[PDB]
Amino acid sequence: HHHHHHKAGEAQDLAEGWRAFLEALKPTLRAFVREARPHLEGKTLVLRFPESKAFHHLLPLARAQFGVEELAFVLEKKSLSGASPPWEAEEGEDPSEELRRLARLLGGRLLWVRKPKAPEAEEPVSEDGIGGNGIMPP
């Protein structure tokens, strides 16, 4: 339950996908599912604890009788996404057409449109400043 405790806004809201181990999104519970799996296990081992749920019917008890054959997300890094005066500019696509440098910036640009500037928004530092620098070697 340590990962559930770290919850910060919608951060762990978009974290069950990052695990993953679901069924085509969400059959059963307002998952996480990883909160029903340790409860089934109980404490640490302990056989009364695993057994309990088993008599009524950590990771491999779940593998026994559970919705697994779907595959959504992977890492831990994969993303996707978590969808379910100077400015850019010029214009704007993306990819960028005035700046920017050249790795992992388009992604930011892609995210960006539109249309505030500044603002700065989390909290600093660069972005408007760099734009300024370019309007600067006009």
Binding site: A8, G9, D13
Partner: protein, 102 residues
Amino acid sequence: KSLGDFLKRLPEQVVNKRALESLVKAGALDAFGDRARLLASLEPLLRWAAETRERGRSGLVGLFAEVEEPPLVEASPLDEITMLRYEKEALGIYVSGHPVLR
């Protein structure tokens, strides 16, 4: 076990809202969540904590004397500048990092 478990157990009588705020800011409740999320969830869970007592204080026991704590009310994560500003307020000294190191 949780922020709700903390509030219903230690009432506002003992640990008041002013004290609870800095207890979150200082980091005493970091084991239950994000500071911004916890601070926001204070007054809602305080009402819930006071509501849990009167259920027990007029019959009932647990299952019907407590609709278990709701999920922590959502909020944006704090930036280090405003986070370390709260730590200085709550502990009187820049505990755990200096704003300049960001």
